[PDB]
């Protein structure tokens, strides 16, 4: 449960969380509201788990791409920056934080690939891709090469492939059209053909990967590479006299790198939405706020126009923002993993000679569509070991009806399958979260687990307590007791499901007195409220 009257902020470990804490300190001094900054490990996978519960931090800082799933799961609150505030930030940054037409985060920082070049080899680096062949010929005669960059990962070759017309998902009217992917079009083929031709003419090696390119550039053996701000410190350390500039154009058009936008989102379950809004809009997203975070750890380019003008005195920061404005926001939808796989396969196959460019992109298109269809199926349906020519959505399979007859467990149908319920009286000694001695001797929970094991379907364990007559507030001791009881039951189920053909997900959640089943004004009613729910999700009914 989130603590009203204060703010808990999650930001990743590689950011300037100490400077974020300073901004929190000034927030406290000015308003008395204390701000706590944390960097939990894997916070991007923690947040969707705890916020679904209603727990978590009030503010989460992460790259914008994951916020799409959170927004889909309803974990983020819509934000309401006014017109004057939105004009303070670069317009394109607001597109990175829109889900179904609703603003759902504040853009902080901006990141994209750039052209990195050796100033001693190349004081005036080429403006166009097309002029790189002749440049490599000249540099080959010196014992050098023009350009080496990671050809294994489509993140790095996509800027050229998109330049003349390739795209991932058509972005029209603030939404991504997963039916309109632009891998198999002429622009994509023209770019991928140019890339393949550089390899056939020996200007590049098809095996070149991230490590090979970095070593060659940082050793002064190639005049240019393509990388992100995360690579600059290794170049600094190699002391190669280097610069950072706009990516070359292709057929007169900008290379279009994908843009990652560090964003700040507000938890939908937060009871401090007004405090969060005020911290972000009036303290963090300001020259002073951003500068404080940036001194701790560089943000790179930033969405806030006024501070970006200050950071852009470094020509490398200016180039990052320039490439980002010419690029495309990374789509925040799950179908991107079909796009990435399909394109990755296409490029290594065209570059290796295994396929022509047109066959490889033709296959990428049909592969991606098939992949997206199959991913949806595993979301919306269950692929299960089925009896051949009993419907467990209408008839509980044996031995469940027997277990339900033993006087301790009940069931009712649920919109997502079956809700099993058992009162916690008797399952646990008074005030106890360890399972009663009686339940252990009878193997109540483990036989229930063994009864579910031959069948698919995830489980959700939810503990509830009664509450005291006429109190409209929640008891925090009752909350933790229900959470501990739920965890005991879920662990015991997991253990007894070890022999299942399924590795189902089993979550546990304490609801305390928040979700009563009946009236707490009588013991008749309080009894009903002291219970454990097991939601068995075998499909929608």
From Swiss-Prot:
It comes from the Bacteria. GO terms for molecular function: carbohydrate transmembrane transporter activity; maltose binding. This is Maltose/maltodextrin-binding periplasmic protein. CDD domains: PBP2_MBP (cd13656). PROSITE patterns: SBP_BACTERIAL_1. One of its GO terms (biological process) is maltodextrin transmembrane transport. InterPro entries: Maltose/Cyclodextrin-bd, SBP, SBP_1_CS.
